Design a protein around this motif. Structure first.
Motif, PDB file in Angstrom:
ATOM      1  N   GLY C  23      22.157 -41.529 -14.386  1.00 43.94           N
ATOM      2  CA  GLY C  23      23.127 -40.545 -14.856  1.00 43.94           C
ATOM      3  C   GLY C  23      23.351 -40.504 -16.348  1.00 43.94           C
ATOM      4  N   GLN C  24      23.667 -41.650 -16.943  1.00 43.39           N
ATOM      5  CA  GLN C  24      23.913 -41.693 -18.374  1.00 43.39           C
ATOM      6  C   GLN C  24      22.597 -41.571 -19.138  1.00 43.39           C
ATOM      7  OE1 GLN C  24      26.454 -45.011 -19.391  1.00 43.39           O
ATOM      8  NE2 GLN C  24      27.514 -44.956 -17.414  1.00 43.39           N
ATOM      9  N   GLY C  25      22.700 -41.107 -20.378  1.00 44.25           N
ATOM     10  CA  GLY C  25      21.551 -40.965 -21.244  1.00 44.25           C
ATOM     11  C   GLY C  25      21.055 -39.549 -21.429  1.00 44.25           C
ATOM     12  N   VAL C  26      21.774 -38.555 -20.916  1.00 42.99           N
ATOM     13  CA  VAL C  26      21.393 -37.150 -21.029  1.00 42.99           C
ATOM     14  C   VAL C  26      22.290 -36.522 -22.091  1.00 42.99           C
ATOM     15  CG1 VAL C  26      20.971 -34.995 -19.838  1.00 42.99           C
ATOM     16  CG2 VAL C  26      20.841 -37.163 -18.577  1.00 42.99           C
ATOM     17  N   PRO C  27      21.759 -36.111 -23.241  1.00 48.38           N
ATOM     18  CA  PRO C  27      22.593 -35.380 -24.199  1.00 48.38           C
ATOM     19  C   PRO C  27      23.087 -34.069 -23.609  1.00 48.38           C
ATOM     20  CG  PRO C  27      20.276 -35.243 -24.803  1.00 48.38           C
ATOM     21  CD  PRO C  27      20.372 -36.263 -23.711  1.00 48.38           C
ATOM     22  N   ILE C  28      24.312 -33.710 -23.977  1.00 51.07           N
ATOM     23  CA  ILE C  28      25.024 -32.574 -23.405  1.00 51.07           C
ATOM     24  C   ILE C  28      24.835 -31.358 -24.298  1.00 51.07           C
ATOM     25  CG2 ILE C  28      26.707 -33.890 -22.075  1.00 51.07           C
ATOM     26  CD1 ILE C  28      28.572 -33.858 -24.383  1.00 51.07           C
ATOM     27  N   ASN C  29      24.716 -30.186 -23.679  1.00 51.81           N
ATOM     28  CA  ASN C  29      24.545 -28.941 -24.416  1.00 51.81           C
ATOM     29  C   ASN C  29      25.425 -27.889 -23.762  1.00 51.81           C
ATOM     30  OD1 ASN C  29      23.706 -26.520 -25.638  1.00 51.81           O
ATOM     31  ND2 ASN C  29      21.586 -27.221 -25.841  1.00 51.81           N
ATOM     32  N   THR C  30      26.290 -27.262 -24.565  1.00 50.94           N
ATOM     33  CA  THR C  30      27.168 -26.221 -24.044  1.00 50.94           C
ATOM     34  C   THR C  30      26.404 -24.955 -23.681  1.00 50.94           C
ATOM     35  OG1 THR C  30      27.677 -25.378 -26.254  1.00 50.94           O
ATOM     36  CG2 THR C  30      29.060 -27.157 -25.396  1.00 50.94           C
ATOM     37  N   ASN C  31      25.306 -24.669 -24.384  1.00 52.21           N
ATOM     38  CA  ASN C  31      24.453 -23.548 -24.002  1.00 52.21           C
ATOM     39  C   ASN C  31      23.744 -23.795 -22.677  1.00 52.21           C
ATOM     40  OD1 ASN C  31      24.676 -21.375 -25.880  1.00 52.21           O
ATOM     41  ND2 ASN C  31      23.630 -22.621 -27.428  1.00 52.21           N
ATOM     42  N   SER C  32      23.515 -25.056 -22.320  1.00 54.32           N
ATOM     43  CA  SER C  32      22.777 -25.375 -21.106  1.00 54.32           C
ATOM     44  C   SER C  32      23.689 -25.296 -19.888  1.00 54.32           C
ATOM     45  CB  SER C  32      22.160 -26.769 -21.211  1.00 54.32           C
ATOM     46  OG  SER C  32      23.164 -27.771 -21.199  1.00 54.32           O
ATOM     47  N   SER C  33      23.234 -24.587 -18.859  1.00 55.07           N
ATOM     48  CA  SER C  33      23.939 -24.579 -17.591  1.00 55.07           C
ATOM     49  C   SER C  33      23.732 -25.919 -16.889  1.00 55.07           C
ATOM     50  CB  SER C  33      23.441 -23.429 -16.718  1.00 55.07           C
ATOM     51  OG  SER C  33      23.674 -22.180 -17.344  1.00 55.07           O
ATOM     52  N   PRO C  34      24.593 -26.263 -15.927  1.00 56.14           N
ATOM     53  CA  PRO C  34      24.410 -27.541 -15.218  1.00 56.14           C
ATOM     54  C   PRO C  34      23.074 -27.662 -14.508  1.00 56.14           C
ATOM     55  CG  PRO C  34      26.618 -26.704 -14.853  1.00 56.14           C
ATOM     56  CD  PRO C  34      25.870 -25.617 -15.575  1.00 56.14           C
ATOM     57  N   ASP C  35      22.434 -26.545 -14.149  1.00 55.87           N
ATOM     58  CA  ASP C  35      21.126 -26.627 -13.507  1.00 55.87           C
ATOM     59  C   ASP C  35      20.046 -27.023 -14.507  1.00 55.87           C
ATOM     60  OD1 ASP C  35      22.795 -24.067 -12.496  1.00 55.87           O
ATOM     61  OD2 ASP C  35      21.901 -25.066 -10.758  1.00 55.87           O
ATOM     62  N   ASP C  36      20.149 -26.525 -15.741  1.00 56.67           N
ATOM     63  CA  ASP C  36      19.091 -26.709 -16.727  1.00 56.67           C
ATOM     64  C   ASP C  36      19.057 -28.124 -17.287  1.00 56.67           C
ATOM     65  OD1 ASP C  36      19.615 -24.108 -16.129  1.00 56.67           O
ATOM     66  OD2 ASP C  36      19.661 -23.377 -18.200  1.00 56.67           O
ATOM     67  N   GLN C  37      20.143 -28.880 -17.138  1.00 54.81           N
ATOM     68  CA  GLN C  37      20.312 -30.180 -17.789  1.00 54.81           C
ATOM     69  C   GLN C  37      19.458 -31.223 -17.073  1.00 54.81           C
ATOM     70  OE1 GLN C  37      24.513 -31.005 -17.993  1.00 54.81           O
ATOM     71  NE2 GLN C  37      25.000 -28.897 -18.596  1.00 54.81           N
ATOM     72  N   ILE C  38      18.161 -31.196 -17.378  1.00 51.93           N
ATOM     73  CA  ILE C  38      17.200 -32.120 -16.784  1.00 51.93           C
ATOM     74  C   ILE C  38      15.967 -32.201 -17.674  1.00 51.93           C
ATOM     75  CG2 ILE C  38      16.447 -30.220 -15.301  1.00 51.93           C
ATOM     76  CD1 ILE C  38      15.356 -32.275 -13.359  1.00 51.93           C
ATOM     77  N   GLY C  39      15.500 -33.416 -17.933  1.00 50.41           N
ATOM     78  CA  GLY C  39      14.383 -33.598 -18.838  1.00 50.41           C
ATOM     79  C   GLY C  39      13.978 -35.051 -18.942  1.00 50.41           C
ATOM     80  N   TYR C  40      13.286 -35.380 -20.031  1.00 46.86           N
ATOM     81  CA  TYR C  40      12.754 -36.720 -20.228  1.00 46.86           C
ATOM     82  C   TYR C  40      12.915 -37.151 -21.679  1.00 46.86           C
ATOM     83  CZ  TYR C  40       8.670 -34.266 -22.128  1.00 46.86           C
ATOM     84  OH  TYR C  40       7.836 -33.455 -22.864  1.00 46.86           O
ATOM     85  N   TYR C  41      12.571 -38.412 -21.927  1.00 45.06           N
ATOM     86  CA  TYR C  41      12.521 -38.989 -23.262  1.00 45.06           C
ATOM     87  C   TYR C  41      11.100 -39.459 -23.525  1.00 45.06           C
ATOM     88  CZ  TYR C  41      17.563 -39.175 -24.301  1.00 45.06           C
ATOM     89  OH  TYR C  41      18.868 -38.861 -24.593  1.00 45.06           O
ATOM     90  N   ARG C  42      10.621 -39.194 -24.734  1.00 44.97           N
ATOM     91  CA  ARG C  42       9.279 -39.555 -25.167  1.00 44.97           C
ATOM     92  C   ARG C  42       9.394 -40.422 -26.411  1.00 44.97           C
ATOM     93  NH1 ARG C  42       5.349 -38.526 -28.830  1.00 44.97           N
ATOM     94  NH2 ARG C  42       3.202 -38.801 -28.084  1.00 44.97           N
ATOM     95  N   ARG C  43       8.667 -41.533 -26.435  1.00 45.13           N
ATOM     96  CA  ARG C  43       8.679 -42.384 -27.612  1.00 45.13           C
ATOM     97  C   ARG C  43       7.820 -41.723 -28.680  1.00 45.13           C
ATOM     98  NH1 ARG C  43       8.487 -47.801 -26.254  1.00 45.13           N
ATOM     99  NH2 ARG C  43       6.606 -47.307 -25.048  1.00 45.13           N
TER     100      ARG C  43
END
Lengths: 129, 109, 114
Positions: C23-43
């Motif tokens: 759950g934690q570790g996802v930066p929040i975006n007001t433009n992003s809908s709750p569905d869109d808030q999904i992704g990854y981290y790349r070194r």
């Protein structure tokens, strides 16, 4: 808590078939799997089914004689195994799971691609005498 | 594919031991969906670990999962006689299926 | 150089490798809908740095959620729909500037990060 009941024990002869049921005491987007275990041997995954979609995936070793089907209205799922032979003497399990795939997320903490509930276990034996 | 597991495992009770579960690049080391199950002799399988590390509620912290390369490892800590059962690993595949291990039977001295 | 991450770097001053509980570790975006808030981290290739990219975008746009690759760790919010996030895409530095890392309220603070 959700538990699973099945069809009772069966004793069939080679060449015939068998149709076991798996009733759940959520039948929406549920990965229902059937697993096998030969006596004294390891576990062997066989198949999957999503009921509301109807798409069933099978392990290639079993692809061709096992068939998984779902009855979403009755919240029951059947499995149809034909061409029974001696090596198919084993204990058969069913289990309910969840898979993400291409659907929406839920903080339900669903355990994705792991079957969290199991049935009691159906023993299918095939003989000659 | 194929999932290699140790046939048998045992140790002095009360202690801990690491049990391996090895596969290929596209079944264990490609996806994060390694699972672990317990099956008592005569009883149906039971869950202890669903994601590589995640533990379902109602399961003591004596069970914890980990993965290195293509070889996941189960680490039971403070082993008791109440844990006497079979232990199998499972994982998702690039072929969109499930594969189980060969089986690791336990015994407490 | 026309493609970049929407968020700033996360410099790793410590020796411990980066990790995040569920759950934690996802930066929040007001433009992003709750569905869109999904992704990854790349070194960051070439201290190490980490960039967040939405699912189906960035340098690893072809990876499905849950893949195992060194340098890639996956995060997601609750209720996030599994879709290619093509309507967000990536950031063009020529047309838009990098956005400060927007961590959620009262999240985990591993060693080296203040």
């Amino acid at each position: 808590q959700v538990h699973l009941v099945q069809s009772g024990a069966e004793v069939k002869k080679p060449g015939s078939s068998v149709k076991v049921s798996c009733k759940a005491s959520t039948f929406s987007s549920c990965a229902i799997s059937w697993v096998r275990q030969a006596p004294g041997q390891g576990l062997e995954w066989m198949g999957r089914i999503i009921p509301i979609l109807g798409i069933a995936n099978y392990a290639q070793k079993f692809q061709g004689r096992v068939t998984i089907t779902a009855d979403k209205s009755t919240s029951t799922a059947y499995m149809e195994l034909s061409s029974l032979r001696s090596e198919d003497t084993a204990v058969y399990y069913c289990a309910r799971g969840w898979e993400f795939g291409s659907g929406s997320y839920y903080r339900t903490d669903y355990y994705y691609y792991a079957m969290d509930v199991w049935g009691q276990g159906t023993t299918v034996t095939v003989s000659s005498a | 594919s194929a999932l290699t597991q140790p046939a048998s495992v045992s140790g002095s009770p009360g202690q801990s031991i690491t049990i391996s579960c090895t596969g290929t690049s596209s079944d264990v080391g490609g996806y994060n969906y390694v699972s672990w199950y317990q099956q008592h002799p005569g009883k149906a399988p039971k869950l202890m670990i669903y994601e590589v590390t995640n533990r379902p509620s109602g399961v003591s912290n004596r069970f914890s999962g980990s993965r290195s390369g293509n070889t996941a490892s189960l680490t039971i800590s403070g082993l008791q006689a109440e844990d006497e059962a079979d232990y199998y690993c499972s994982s998702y595949t690039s072929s969109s299926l499930y594969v189980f291990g060969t089986g690791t039977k336990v015994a407490v001295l | 150089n026309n493609t970049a991450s929407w968020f700033t770097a996360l410099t790793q001053h410590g020796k411990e490798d980066l990790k995040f509980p569920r759950g934690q570790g996802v930066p929040i975006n007001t433009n992003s809908s709750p569905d869109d808030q999904i992704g990854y981290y790349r070194r960051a290739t070439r201290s190490p740095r980490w960039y967040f990219y939405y699912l189906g975008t960035g340098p690893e746009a072809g990876l499905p959620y849950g893949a195992n690759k060194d340098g890639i760790i996956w995060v997601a919010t609750e209720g996030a729909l599994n879709t290619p996030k093509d309507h967000i895409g990536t950031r063009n530095p020529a047309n838009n500037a990098a956005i400060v890392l927007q961590l959620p309220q009262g999240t985990t603070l591993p060693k080296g990060f203040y």
